[PDB]
From a paper:
Like the scCST, the hCST (Ctc1, hStn1 and hTen1) complex is predicted to contain multiple OB-folds and it binds telomeric overhangs with high affinity and some specificity. Overall, hCST plays a role in telomere replication, and may also have a more general role under conditions of replicative stress. To further elucidate the role of hCST at the telomeres, we solved the structures of hTen1 in complex with the N-terminal domain of hStn1 (hStn1N), and the C-terminal domain of hStn1 (hStn1C) alone. These structures reveal that hStn1-Ten1 is a RPA-like complex and a structural homologue of Schizosaccharomyces pombe Stn1Ten1 (spStn1Ten1) and Candida tropicalis Stn1Ten1 (ctStn1Ten1).
To elucidate the function of the human telomeric Stn1-Ten1 complex in telomere biology, we prepared the full-length hStn1-Ten1, the truncated hStn1N-Ten1 and hStn1C proteins to homogeneity. In both RPA and Stn1, the OB fold is a ssDNA-binding domain while the C-terminal domain is important for protein-protein interactions. The additional wHTH motif in hStn1 may allow interaction with a different set of proteins that function at telomeres such as Ctc1.
Numbering used by the authors: 190 to 246, 258 to 368
């Protein structure tokens, strides 16, 4: 509550961290599926937080920079992702991509296409290798981890060993 009440006291990295947290809260509360960066810049509560003297010391570039860095923190955490689409400012929210969840679930249900003499289920890295071939070549470890956590929360998959998953 303190930082949010006086964000002008923060150094730029701390401010960027805080903006990223408030951006996450916005995206989750509104069940946003995809967004252009500029849409977050238009949320008054986010722009008011971001717009501190430290960002200014062009103006549009200063605002673009802090918002881009905040969104990238969410990307690094696997909460948002991009497609190879030529749209630098378009982002997708991992938790809202139902097709992605279903496809990862299917990969796991099918034991990552392993012959039936091998172990049921598959390792994180195997799932990732399959998903990059069949779904999205750029899929990060962090985005996959977020999908797996959601599937686990839904009791659709179970971890039987460290980083190893089978259908529930």
């Amino acid at each position: 509550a303190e930082a949010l009440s006086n964000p002008g006291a923060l150094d730029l990295p701390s401010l960027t961290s805080l903006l990223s947290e408030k951006a996450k809260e916005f995206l989750m509360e509104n069940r946003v599926q995809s967004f252009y960066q500029q849409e977050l810049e238009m949320v008054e509560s986010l722009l008011s937080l971001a717009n501190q003297p430290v960002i200014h010391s062009t103006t549009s570039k200063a605002i673009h920079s802090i918002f881009k860095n905040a969104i990238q923190l969410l990307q690094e955490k696997g909460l948002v992702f991009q497609k190879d689409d030529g749209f630098d400012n378009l982002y997708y929210v991992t938790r809202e991509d139902k097709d992605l969840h279903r496809k990862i679930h299917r990969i796991i249900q099918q034991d990552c296409q392993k012959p039936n003499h091998m172990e049921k289920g598959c390792h994180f890295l195997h799932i990732l290798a399959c998903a990059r071939l069949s779904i999205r070549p750029g899929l990060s470890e962090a985005v996959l981890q977020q999908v797996l956590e959601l599937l686990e929360d839904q009791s659709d998959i179970v971890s039987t060993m460290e980083h190893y998953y089978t259908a529930f």
